Amino acid sequence: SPTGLAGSLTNALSNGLLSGGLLGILENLPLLDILGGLLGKVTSVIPGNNVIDIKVTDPQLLELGLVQSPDGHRLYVTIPLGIKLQVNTPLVGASLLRLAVKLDITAEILAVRDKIHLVLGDCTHSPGSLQISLLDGLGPLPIQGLLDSLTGILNKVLPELVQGNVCPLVNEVLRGLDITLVHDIVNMLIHGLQFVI
Amino acid sequence: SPTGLAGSLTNALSNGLLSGGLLGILENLPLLDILLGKVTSVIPGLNNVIDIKVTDPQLLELGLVQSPDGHRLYVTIPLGIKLQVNTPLVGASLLRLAVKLDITAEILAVRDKQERIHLVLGDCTHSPGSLQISLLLPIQGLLDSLTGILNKVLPELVQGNVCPLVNEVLRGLDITLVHDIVNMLIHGLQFVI
Ligand SMILES: [N+]
Ligand code: NA
């Protein structure tokens, strides 16, 4: 089952991310930190328990993708990510929405010189990767009256959040990859040779 | 466990050989099958001169080296066996031997006139100066006789039975491992440390 560089890099990346650890990073996202208006936020806190609450669970990593530029000098790894968002309200003590979330992080890997060598270029959220799906709901009301408003803000906040949280890690994983694996992959890029087919 | 090509190649070969399966081939070597005293034993009815068993077949760490131009590759396949010598005539054992032998497979990348690149074996040979022999009522006499014949027969026998295998293994290697190695050899690029 030993294989070539392409299959070795993605296998090595995954193992690096998981010992990062990515899943913990994907469980401890500060979604509320960022996500009338404040009057309610104030009335509930001063209420002396309420508001809505959001739990992050079932974080997961899926099979990485790998694509190489036609010229052969650049590598683009895509990192499919998954989380579930449990939307509740402690006030009534009920769960209103259960969402499944999927998102991709597209990291570009470059070869660079500074006397370590295989480095992260652009880390970003792939456009169109964010798929929010309804898993469960208290009833027809939150689904017909809350979801779309909720997902709407989510399509605006999450991607840049995940990118910012995940993106540092992959760089830490690139530097720390097997020395000999890196060396070989660099050679192939420098000479614009295809190893991802 | 994920490494570069060199590291990956060695592990791939080791797993490939063992599941080949190399050990069985070494045990089943036809050492015996190979004048007056010889024909005499045949004519009598109820007698067998001597027998040899091969035991404790073992595969050691492969060695890898790359040519200076970076176009050819030389993998070293260290081998080990134990030879127990018996005389079935009497019911006795005789002596035990430890034999260590090295096989050297050269691995090349050649370009086809049709732009296709194939990875090719040619050639495999028992490595000169590899064969080593050690001792585990008297028996000092035959020892030099057994040592002498082993010294002029074994290496070619092992080469003959083993390197057909390695050739089988190289064919069955991972498609992308081969394509990656081949590209780097045919473009003269070092990946062996
Ligand atoms: N809504
Ligand atoms: Na629910």
Neighbours of B154 (CB within 10 A): 20
Q: Residue B91 carries which DSSP code?
A: S
**Alpha-carbon gap: A66 to the closest alpha carbon of chain B (Å):** 14
Phi, psi of A194 (to 5 degrees): -85, 125
- Strands B63-66 and A53-61 come out as unpaired
User: What burial letters (b/e) apply to B103-125, b meaning 16+ CB within 10 Å?
Assistant: bbbebbbeeeeeeeeebebeebe
User: Distance (Å, rounded) from C-alpha B178 to C-alpha B15?
Assistant: 15
- Of A63, A83, A67, A70, give the one whose Cα is nearest residue A13: A63
Helix, strand, or coil here: B92? coil
Domains of chain B, start order: 1-193 (3.15.10.10)
B83 closest CA partner among B130, B60, B51: B51
3-state secondary structure of A14: helix
Tally A–B CB contacts below 8 A.
73
- Rounded distance between C-alpha atoms, residue A21 and residue A14, angstroms: 10
* DSSP annotation of A52: -
A5 vs B: CB within 8 A: yes
Question: If you measure from the C-alpha of residue A142 to the centroid of ligand 2, how many angstroms do you get, rounded to a whole number?
Answer: 10
Q: Which two tokens stand for residue B192?
A: 């062996």
Q: How far apart are CA B161 and CA B146, in angstroms?
A: 21
- Residues listed for chain B: 193
Distance, CA of A169 to CA of A21 (rounded, Å): 8
Residues in chain A with CB shorter than 8 Å from the CB of B177 are 2-4
Cβ atoms of residues A71 and A102 within 8 Å: no
* CA pair distance A52, A32, nearest whole angstrom: 10
State the burial class of residue A77 (Cβ atoms within 10 Å of its Cβ: 0-12, 13-18, 19+).
buried
The residue count for chain A: 197
Q: What technique solved it?
A: X-ray
Per-window interface: A 14-33 vs B, CB < 8 A:
15
CA dihedral over A73, A193, A169, A171, signed as positive or negative: negative
What φ, ψ does residue A70 adopt, rounded to 5°? -60, -35
Q: Which of B183, B65, B4, B9 is nearest to A182 (CA)?
A: B4
SS3 A63: coil
Tell me the three state secondary structure of residue B31: coil
Give residues 176 to 195 of A whose Cβ lies within 8 Å of B. Answer: 178, 180-181, 183-185, 187-188, 191, 193-195
Contacts of B70 (CB under 8 A, 6+ apart): B184, B185, B188, B189, B190
- Verify whether the Cβ–Cβ distance B8 to A4 is below 8 Å: yes
Question: Resolution of this entry in Å?
Answer: 2.8
The region, left, alpha or beta by phi > 0 then psi within -120 to 50, assigned to residue A176 is left
Amino acid at B130: S
Give distance in angstroms: CA of B170 to centre of ligand 1: 61
Cβ proximity of B17 and A192 under 8 Å: no
Other beta carbons within 10 angstroms of residue A76's beta carbon come to 17
Q: Residue type for A106, please?
A: T
Cα–Cα distance for residue pair A16/A31, rounded to 1 Å: 25
**Cβ–Cβ contact A103 with B under 8 A:** no
DSSP B71: S
From the list A127, A83, A125, the residue with the least C-alpha distance to A106 is A125
Q: How far is the CA of A59 from the centre of ligand 2 (A)?
A: 18
